[PDB]
Short mmCIF file of C-alpha atoms in Angstrom, two decimals:
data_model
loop_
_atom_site.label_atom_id
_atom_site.label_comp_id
_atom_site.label_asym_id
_atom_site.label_seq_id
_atom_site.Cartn_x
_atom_site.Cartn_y
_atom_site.Cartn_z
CA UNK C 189 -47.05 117.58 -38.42
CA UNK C 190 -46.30 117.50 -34.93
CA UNK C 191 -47.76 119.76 -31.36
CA UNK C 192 -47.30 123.43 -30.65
CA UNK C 193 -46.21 125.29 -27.59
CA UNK C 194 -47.26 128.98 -26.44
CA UNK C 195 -46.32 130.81 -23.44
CA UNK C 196 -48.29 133.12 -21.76
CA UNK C 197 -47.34 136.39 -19.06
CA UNK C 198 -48.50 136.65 -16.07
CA UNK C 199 -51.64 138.67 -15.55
CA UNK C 200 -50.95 141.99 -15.76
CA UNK C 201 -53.12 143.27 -12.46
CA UNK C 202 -51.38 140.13 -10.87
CA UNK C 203 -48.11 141.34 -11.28
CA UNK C 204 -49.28 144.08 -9.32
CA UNK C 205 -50.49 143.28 -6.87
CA UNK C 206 -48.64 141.79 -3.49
CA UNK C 207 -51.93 139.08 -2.88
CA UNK C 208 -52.42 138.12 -6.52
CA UNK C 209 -50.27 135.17 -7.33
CA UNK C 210 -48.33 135.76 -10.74
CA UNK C 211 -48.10 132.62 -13.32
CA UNK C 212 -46.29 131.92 -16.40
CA UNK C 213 -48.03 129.55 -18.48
CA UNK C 214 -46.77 126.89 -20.60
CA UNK C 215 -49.43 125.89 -22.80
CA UNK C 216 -49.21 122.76 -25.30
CA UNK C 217 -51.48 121.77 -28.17
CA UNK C 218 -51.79 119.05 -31.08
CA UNK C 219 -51.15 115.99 -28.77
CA UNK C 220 -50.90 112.67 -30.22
CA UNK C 221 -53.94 110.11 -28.13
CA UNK C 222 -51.11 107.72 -29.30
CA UNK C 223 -48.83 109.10 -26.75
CA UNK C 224 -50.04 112.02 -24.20
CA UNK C 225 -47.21 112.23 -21.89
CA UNK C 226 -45.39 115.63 -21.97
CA UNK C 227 -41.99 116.43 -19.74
CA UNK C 228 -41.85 120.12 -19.07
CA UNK C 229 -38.57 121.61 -18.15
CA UNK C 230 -38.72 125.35 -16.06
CA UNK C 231 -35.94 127.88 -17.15
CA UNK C 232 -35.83 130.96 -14.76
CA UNK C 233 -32.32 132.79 -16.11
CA UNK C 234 -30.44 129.57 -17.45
CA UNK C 235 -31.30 128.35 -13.66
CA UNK C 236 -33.38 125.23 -13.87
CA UNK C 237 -36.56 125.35 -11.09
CA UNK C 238 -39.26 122.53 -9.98
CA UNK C 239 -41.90 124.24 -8.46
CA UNK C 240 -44.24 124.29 -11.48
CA UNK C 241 -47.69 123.06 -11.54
CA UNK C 242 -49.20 120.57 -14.13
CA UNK C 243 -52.76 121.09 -15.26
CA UNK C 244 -55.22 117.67 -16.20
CA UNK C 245 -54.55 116.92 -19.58
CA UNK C 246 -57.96 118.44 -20.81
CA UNK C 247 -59.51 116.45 -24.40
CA UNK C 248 -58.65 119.27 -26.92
CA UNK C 249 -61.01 117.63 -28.93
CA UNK C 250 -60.42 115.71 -31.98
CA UNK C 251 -57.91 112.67 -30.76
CA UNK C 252 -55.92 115.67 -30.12
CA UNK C 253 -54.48 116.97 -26.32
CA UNK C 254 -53.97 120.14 -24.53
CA UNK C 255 -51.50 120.34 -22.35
CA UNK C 256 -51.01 123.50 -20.17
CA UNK C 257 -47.83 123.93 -17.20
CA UNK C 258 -48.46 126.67 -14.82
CA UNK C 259 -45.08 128.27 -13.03
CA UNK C 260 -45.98 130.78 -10.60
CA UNK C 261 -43.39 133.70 -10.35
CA UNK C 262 -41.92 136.20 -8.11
CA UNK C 263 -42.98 139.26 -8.36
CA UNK C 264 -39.59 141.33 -8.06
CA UNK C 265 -38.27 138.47 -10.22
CA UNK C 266 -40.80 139.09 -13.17
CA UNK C 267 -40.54 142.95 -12.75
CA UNK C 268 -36.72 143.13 -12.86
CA UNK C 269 -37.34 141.18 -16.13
CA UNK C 270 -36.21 138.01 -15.04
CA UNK C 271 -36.44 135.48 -18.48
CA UNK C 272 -38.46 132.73 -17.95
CA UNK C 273 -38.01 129.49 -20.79
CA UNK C 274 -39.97 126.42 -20.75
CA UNK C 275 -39.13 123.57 -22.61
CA UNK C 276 -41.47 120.78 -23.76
CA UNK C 277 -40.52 117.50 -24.71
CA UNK C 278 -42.12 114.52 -26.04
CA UNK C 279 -41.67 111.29 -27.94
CA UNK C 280 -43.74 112.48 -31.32
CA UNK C 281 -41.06 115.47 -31.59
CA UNK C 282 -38.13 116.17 -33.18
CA UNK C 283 -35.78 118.31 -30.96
CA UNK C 284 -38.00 119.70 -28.04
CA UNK C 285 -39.85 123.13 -28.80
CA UNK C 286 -38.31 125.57 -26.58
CA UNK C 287 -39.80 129.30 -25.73
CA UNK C 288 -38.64 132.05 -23.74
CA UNK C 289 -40.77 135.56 -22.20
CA UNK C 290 -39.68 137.88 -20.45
CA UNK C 291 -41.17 141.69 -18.88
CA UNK C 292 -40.11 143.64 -22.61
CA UNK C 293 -36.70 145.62 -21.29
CA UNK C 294 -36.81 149.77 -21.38
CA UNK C 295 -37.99 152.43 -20.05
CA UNK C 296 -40.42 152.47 -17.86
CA UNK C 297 -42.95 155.32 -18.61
CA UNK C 298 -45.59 156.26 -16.65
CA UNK C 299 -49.14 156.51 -18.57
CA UNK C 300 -51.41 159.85 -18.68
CA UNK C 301 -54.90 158.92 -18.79
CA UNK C 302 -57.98 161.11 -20.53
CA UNK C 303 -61.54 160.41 -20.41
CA UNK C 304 -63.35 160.86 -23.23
CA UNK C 305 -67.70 161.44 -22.91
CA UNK C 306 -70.02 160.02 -25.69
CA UNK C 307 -70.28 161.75 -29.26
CA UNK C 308 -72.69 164.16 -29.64
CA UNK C 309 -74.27 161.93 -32.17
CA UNK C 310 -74.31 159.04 -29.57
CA UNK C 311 -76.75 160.64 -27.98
CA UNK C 312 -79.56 159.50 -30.58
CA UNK C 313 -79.33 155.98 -29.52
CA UNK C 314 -80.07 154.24 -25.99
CA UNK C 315 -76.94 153.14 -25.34
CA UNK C 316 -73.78 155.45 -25.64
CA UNK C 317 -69.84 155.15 -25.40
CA UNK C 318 -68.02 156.15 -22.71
CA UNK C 319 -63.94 156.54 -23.74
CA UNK C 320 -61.00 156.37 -21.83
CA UNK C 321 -58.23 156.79 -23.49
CA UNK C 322 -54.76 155.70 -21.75
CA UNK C 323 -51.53 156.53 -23.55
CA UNK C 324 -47.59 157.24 -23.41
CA UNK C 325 -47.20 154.31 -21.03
CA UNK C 326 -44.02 151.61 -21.27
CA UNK C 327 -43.88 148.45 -20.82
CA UNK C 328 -47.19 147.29 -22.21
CA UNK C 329 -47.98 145.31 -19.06
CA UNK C 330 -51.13 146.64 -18.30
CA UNK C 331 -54.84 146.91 -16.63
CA UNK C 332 -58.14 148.90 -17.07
CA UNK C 333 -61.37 148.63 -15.38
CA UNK C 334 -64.30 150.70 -14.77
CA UNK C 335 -66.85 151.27 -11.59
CA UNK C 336 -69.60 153.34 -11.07
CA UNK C 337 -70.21 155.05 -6.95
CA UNK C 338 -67.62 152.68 -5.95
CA UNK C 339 -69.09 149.51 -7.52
CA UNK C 340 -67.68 147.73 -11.15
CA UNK C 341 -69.27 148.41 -14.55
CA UNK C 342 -68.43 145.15 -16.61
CA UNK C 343 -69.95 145.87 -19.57
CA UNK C 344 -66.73 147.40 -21.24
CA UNK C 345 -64.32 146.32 -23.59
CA UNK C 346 -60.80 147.24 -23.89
CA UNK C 347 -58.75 147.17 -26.60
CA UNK C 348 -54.89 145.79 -26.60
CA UNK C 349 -52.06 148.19 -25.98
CA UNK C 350 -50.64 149.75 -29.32
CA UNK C 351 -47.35 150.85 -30.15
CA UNK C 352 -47.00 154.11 -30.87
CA UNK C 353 -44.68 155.96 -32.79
CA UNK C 354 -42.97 157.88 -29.81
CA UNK C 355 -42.14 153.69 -28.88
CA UNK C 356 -44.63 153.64 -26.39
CA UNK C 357 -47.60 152.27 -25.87
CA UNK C 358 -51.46 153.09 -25.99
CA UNK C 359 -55.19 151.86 -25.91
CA UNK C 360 -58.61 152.45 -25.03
CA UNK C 361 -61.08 151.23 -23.01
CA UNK C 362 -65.12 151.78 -24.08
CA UNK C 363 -67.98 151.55 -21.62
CA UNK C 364 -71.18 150.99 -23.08
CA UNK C 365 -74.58 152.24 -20.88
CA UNK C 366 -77.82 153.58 -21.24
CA UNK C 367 -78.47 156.77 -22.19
CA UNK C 368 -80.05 158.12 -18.86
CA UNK C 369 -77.60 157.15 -16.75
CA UNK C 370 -75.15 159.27 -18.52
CA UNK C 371 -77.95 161.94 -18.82
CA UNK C 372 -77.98 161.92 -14.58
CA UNK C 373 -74.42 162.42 -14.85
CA UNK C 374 -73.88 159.59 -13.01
CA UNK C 375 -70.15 159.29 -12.14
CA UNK C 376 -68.07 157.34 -13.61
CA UNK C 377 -64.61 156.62 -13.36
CA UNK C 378 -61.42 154.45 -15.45
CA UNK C 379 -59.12 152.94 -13.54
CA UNK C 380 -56.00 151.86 -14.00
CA UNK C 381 -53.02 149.59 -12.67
CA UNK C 382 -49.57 149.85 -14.03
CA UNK C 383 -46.13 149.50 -12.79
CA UNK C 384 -44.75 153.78 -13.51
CA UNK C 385 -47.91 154.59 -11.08
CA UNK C 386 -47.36 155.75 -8.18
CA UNK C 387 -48.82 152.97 -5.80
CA UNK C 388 -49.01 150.95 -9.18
CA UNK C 389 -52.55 152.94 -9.35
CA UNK C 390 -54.41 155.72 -11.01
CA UNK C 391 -58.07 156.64 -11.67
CA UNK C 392 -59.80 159.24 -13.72
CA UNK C 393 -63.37 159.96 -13.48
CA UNK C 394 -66.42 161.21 -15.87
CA UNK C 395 -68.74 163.95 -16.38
CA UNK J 158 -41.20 114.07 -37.83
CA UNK J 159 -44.03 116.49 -40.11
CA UNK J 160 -44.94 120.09 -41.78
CA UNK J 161 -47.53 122.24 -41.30
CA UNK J 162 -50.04 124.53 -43.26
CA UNK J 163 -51.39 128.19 -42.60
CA UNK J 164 -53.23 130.27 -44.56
CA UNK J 165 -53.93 133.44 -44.23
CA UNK J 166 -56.53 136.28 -45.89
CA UNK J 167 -55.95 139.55 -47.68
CA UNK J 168 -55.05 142.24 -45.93
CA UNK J 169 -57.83 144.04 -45.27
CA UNK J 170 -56.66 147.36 -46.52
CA UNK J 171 -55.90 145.82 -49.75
CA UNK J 172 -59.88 144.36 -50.46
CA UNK J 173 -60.84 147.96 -49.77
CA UNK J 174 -59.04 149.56 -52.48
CA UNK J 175 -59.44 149.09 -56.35
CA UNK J 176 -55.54 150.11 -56.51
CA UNK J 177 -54.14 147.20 -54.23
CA UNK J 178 -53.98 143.51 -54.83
CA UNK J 179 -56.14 141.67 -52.12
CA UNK J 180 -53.87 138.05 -52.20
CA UNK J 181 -54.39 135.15 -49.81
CA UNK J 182 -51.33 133.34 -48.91
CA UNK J 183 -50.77 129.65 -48.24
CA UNK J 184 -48.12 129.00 -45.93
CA UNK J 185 -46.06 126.01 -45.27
CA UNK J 186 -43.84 125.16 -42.51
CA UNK J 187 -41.38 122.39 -41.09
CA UNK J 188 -40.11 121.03 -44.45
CA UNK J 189 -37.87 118.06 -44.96
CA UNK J 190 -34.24 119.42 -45.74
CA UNK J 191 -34.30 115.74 -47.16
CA UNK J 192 -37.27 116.42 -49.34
CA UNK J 193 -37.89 120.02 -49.75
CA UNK J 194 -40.20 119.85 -53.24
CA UNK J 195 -43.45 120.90 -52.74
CA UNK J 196 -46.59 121.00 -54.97
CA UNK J 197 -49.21 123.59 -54.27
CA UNK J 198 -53.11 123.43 -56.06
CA UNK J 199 -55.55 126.36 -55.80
CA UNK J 200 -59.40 126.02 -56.05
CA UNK J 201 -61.90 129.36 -56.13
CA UNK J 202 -65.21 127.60 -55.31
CA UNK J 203 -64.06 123.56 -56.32
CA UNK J 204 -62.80 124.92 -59.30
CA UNK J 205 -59.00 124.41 -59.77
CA UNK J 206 -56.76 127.32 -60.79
CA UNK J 207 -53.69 128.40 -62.02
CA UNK J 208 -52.45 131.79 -61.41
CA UNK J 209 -50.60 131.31 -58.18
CA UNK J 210 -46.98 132.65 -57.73
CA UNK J 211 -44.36 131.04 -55.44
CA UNK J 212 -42.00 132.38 -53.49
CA UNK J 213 -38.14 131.49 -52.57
CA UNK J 214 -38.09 128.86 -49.95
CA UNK J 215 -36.04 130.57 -47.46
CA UNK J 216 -34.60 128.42 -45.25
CA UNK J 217 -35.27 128.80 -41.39
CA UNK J 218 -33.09 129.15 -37.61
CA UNK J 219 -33.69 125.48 -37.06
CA UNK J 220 -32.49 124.49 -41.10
CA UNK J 221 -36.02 123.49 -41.86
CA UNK J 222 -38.18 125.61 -45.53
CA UNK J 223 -40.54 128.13 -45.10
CA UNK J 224 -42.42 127.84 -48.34
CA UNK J 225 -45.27 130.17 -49.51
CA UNK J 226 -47.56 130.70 -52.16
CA UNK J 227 -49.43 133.45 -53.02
CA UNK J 228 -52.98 133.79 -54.78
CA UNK J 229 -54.57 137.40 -55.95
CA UNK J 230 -58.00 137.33 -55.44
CA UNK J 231 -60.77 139.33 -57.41
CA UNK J 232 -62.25 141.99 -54.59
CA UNK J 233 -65.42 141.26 -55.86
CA UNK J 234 -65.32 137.61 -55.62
CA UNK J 235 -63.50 137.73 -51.85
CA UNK J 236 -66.45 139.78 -50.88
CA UNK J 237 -69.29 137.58 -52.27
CA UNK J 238 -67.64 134.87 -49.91
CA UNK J 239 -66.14 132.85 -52.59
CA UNK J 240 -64.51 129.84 -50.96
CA UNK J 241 -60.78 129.51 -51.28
CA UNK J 242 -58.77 126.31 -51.25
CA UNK J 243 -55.03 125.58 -51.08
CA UNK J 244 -54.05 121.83 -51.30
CA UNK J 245 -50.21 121.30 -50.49
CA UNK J 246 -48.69 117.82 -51.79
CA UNK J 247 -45.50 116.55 -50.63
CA UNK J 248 -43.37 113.20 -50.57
CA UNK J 249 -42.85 113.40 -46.39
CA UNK J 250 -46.72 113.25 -46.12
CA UNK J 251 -49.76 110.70 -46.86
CA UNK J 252 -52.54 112.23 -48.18
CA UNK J 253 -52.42 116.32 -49.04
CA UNK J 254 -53.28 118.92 -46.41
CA UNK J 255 -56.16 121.40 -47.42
CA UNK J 256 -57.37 123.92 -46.17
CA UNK J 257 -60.63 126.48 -47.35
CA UNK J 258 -60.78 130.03 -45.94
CA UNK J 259 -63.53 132.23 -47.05
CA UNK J 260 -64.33 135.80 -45.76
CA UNK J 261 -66.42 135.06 -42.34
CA UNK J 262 -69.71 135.16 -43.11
CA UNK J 263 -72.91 136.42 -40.63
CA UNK J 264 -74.99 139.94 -41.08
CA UNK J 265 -72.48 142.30 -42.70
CA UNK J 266 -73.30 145.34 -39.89
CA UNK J 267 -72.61 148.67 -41.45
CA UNK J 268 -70.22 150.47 -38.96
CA UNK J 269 -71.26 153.85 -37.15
CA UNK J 270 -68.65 155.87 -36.82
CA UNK J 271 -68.12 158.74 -33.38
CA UNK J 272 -65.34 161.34 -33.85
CA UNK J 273 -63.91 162.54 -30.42
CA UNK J 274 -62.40 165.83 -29.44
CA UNK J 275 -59.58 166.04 -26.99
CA UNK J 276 -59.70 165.67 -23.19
CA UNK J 277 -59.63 169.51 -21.52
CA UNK J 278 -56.61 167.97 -20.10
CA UNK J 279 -54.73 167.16 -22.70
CA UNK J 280 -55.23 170.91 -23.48
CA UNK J 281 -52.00 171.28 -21.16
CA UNK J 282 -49.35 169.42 -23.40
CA UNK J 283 -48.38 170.66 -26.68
CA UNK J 284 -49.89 168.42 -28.71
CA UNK J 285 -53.09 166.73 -28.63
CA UNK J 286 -55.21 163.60 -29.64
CA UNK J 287 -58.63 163.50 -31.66
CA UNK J 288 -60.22 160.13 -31.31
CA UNK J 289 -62.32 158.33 -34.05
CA UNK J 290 -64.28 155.48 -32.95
CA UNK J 291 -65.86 152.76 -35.41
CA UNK J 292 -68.10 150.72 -34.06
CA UNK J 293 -70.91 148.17 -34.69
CA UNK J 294 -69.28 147.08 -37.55
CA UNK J 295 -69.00 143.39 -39.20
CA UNK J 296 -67.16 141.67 -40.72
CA UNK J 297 -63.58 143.21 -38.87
CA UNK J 298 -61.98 143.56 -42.21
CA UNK J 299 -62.25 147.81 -42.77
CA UNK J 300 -59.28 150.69 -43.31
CA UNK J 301 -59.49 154.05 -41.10
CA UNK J 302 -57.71 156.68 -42.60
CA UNK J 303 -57.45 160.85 -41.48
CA UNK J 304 -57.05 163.66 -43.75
CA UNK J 305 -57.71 167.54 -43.22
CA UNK J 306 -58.59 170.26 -45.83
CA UNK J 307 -58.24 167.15 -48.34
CA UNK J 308 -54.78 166.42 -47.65
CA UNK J 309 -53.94 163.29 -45.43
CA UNK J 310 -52.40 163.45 -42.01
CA UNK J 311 -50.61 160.16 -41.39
CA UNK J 312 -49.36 160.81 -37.61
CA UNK J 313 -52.11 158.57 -36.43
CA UNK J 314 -52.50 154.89 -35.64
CA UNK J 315 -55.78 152.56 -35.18
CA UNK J 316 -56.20 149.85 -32.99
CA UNK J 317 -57.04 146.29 -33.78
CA UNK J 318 -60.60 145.92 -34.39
CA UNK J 319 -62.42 143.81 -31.37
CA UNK J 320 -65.31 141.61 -30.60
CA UNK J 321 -67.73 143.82 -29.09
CA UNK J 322 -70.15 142.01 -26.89
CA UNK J 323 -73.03 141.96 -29.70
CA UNK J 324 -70.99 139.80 -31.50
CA UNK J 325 -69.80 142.56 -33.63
CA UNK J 326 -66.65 144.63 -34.02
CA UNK J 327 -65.26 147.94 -33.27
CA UNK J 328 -61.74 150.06 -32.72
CA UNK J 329 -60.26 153.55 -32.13
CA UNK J 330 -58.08 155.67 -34.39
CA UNK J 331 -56.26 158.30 -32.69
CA UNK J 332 -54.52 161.25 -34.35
CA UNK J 333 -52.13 163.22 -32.47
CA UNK J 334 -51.53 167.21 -33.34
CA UNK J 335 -50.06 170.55 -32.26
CA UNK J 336 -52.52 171.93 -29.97
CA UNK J 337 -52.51 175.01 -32.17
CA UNK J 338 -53.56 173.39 -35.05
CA UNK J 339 -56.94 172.35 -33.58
CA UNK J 340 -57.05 175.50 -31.33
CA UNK J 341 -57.99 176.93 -34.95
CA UNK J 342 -60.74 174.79 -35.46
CA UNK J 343 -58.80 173.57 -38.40
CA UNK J 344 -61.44 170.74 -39.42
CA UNK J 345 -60.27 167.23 -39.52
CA UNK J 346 -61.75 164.01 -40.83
CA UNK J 347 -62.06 160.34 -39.88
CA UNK J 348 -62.77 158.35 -43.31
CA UNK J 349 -63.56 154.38 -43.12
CA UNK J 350 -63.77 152.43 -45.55
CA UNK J 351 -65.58 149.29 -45.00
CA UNK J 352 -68.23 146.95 -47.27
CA UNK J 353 -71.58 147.37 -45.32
CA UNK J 354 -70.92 150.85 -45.56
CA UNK J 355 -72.63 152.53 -48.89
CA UNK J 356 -70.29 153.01 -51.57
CA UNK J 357 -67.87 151.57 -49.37
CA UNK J 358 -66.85 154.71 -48.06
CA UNK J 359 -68.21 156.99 -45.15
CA UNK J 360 -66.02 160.30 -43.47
CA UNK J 361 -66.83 162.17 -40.61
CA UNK J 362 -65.23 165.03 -39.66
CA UNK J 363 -63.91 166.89 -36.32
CA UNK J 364 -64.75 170.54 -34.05
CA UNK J 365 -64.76 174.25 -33.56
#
């Protein structure tokens, strides 16, 4: 039984953003201790590239290795749905594991966005559930956050993008806070980055 | 040069219901076109057993087996955390892999479940979306279904549950309608099934 190799998308706020820096990732795990040297090959369109950085070999902790390859991308490049394949080599290996991602080609559809307050049952305990719901959007690349009076609320968990049966995509985001500051009616607001916004940005705010 | 071993639990939705077969699955991957025999042993709690089915190696992209064997489990047993153990023997290995798998143990937390009307803007568009949300919950395994007047709806789909920050789980099922239909005050119903919950079973239904 030999290593395993998993390749990750950029960011999806990255992506969108001009001064965040967009990386693939190349990630490698199960390394022999006997022998820990990896060659990483970069793959933009066929089009080998050598710009990739390499990540210390961190103890995954058991004799094993894990191995991670960071290629940042082009923007433009990733959104036209440029295919990016790395290919990982090394001597305990067969023929070297080879993986390709790419921005998932289609439509792109912008996403409506509805917020959703707290059950009326919520209300019972201290803390209540604040709902955004954000749906209809394609591709699934994707980002929701949540702020309060212009500052972030981190105490939120989002859930990961669903298909639905139209073929596009949907999730939720919950924010979780104490009853009172709902029963101010405090503002708050869901926010969200996605390519089929205009200025890659929309918010929607709360009660 | 080696193979690999993956095993997997029930579905959830199958544990839940008397009527479905809750199985756990060991699977087995890069195997010797040279040596492509493989012998699979079960054990329910140390004890050995010997009701397992197995399935036609089907060959893969890169000519290498995919071999998998499947065990039904007793719901009963799954969900008093009986410990589950698949030991895979073959020539192209030393000693046989094992590996347990058991359903993840910790405070079962009995869900509380939050039905959720739609936005007034979705009011606009022709049809509309009523929001369940389960939270609270552990372990993740649970089923959310919707029905209405006692008859199920089934143009809905439920997220993956997710690790709250308490350490427990939650998710959202979201049904989508003709406006109409709710603009009667037709009553819909969010039903969850899900062990910590009391006979299993707990609905709540949906508006004016």
């Amino acid at each position: 039984g030999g290593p395993s190799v998993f390749l990750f998308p950029p960011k999806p706020k990255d992506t969108l953003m001009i001064s965040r820096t967009p990386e693939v990732t190349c990630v490698v795990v199960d390394v022999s201790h006997e022998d820990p040297e990896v060659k990483f090959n970069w793959y933009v369109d066929g089009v080998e590239v050598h710009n990739a950085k390499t990540k210390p070999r961190e103890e995954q902790y058991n004799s094993t290795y894990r191995v991670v390859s960071v290629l940042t991308v082009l923007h433009q490049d990733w959104l036209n749905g440029k295919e990016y394949k790395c290919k990982v080599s090394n001597k305990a290996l067969p023929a070297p594991i080879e993986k390709t991602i790419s921005k998932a080609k289609g439509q792109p559809r912008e996403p409506q966005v509805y917020t959703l307050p707290p059950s009326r049952d919520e209300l019972t305990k201290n803390q209540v559930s604040l709902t955004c719901l954000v749906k209809g959007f394609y591709p699934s690349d994707i980002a929701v956050e949540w702020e309060s009076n212009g500052q972030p609320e981190n105490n939120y968990k989002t859930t990961p993008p669903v298909l639905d049966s139209d073929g596009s995509f949907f999730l939720y985001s919950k924010l979780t806070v104490d009853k009172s500051r709902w029963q101010q009616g405090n503002v708050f607001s869901c926010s969200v980055m996605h390519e089929a916004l205009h200025n890659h940005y929309t918010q929607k705010s709360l009660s």
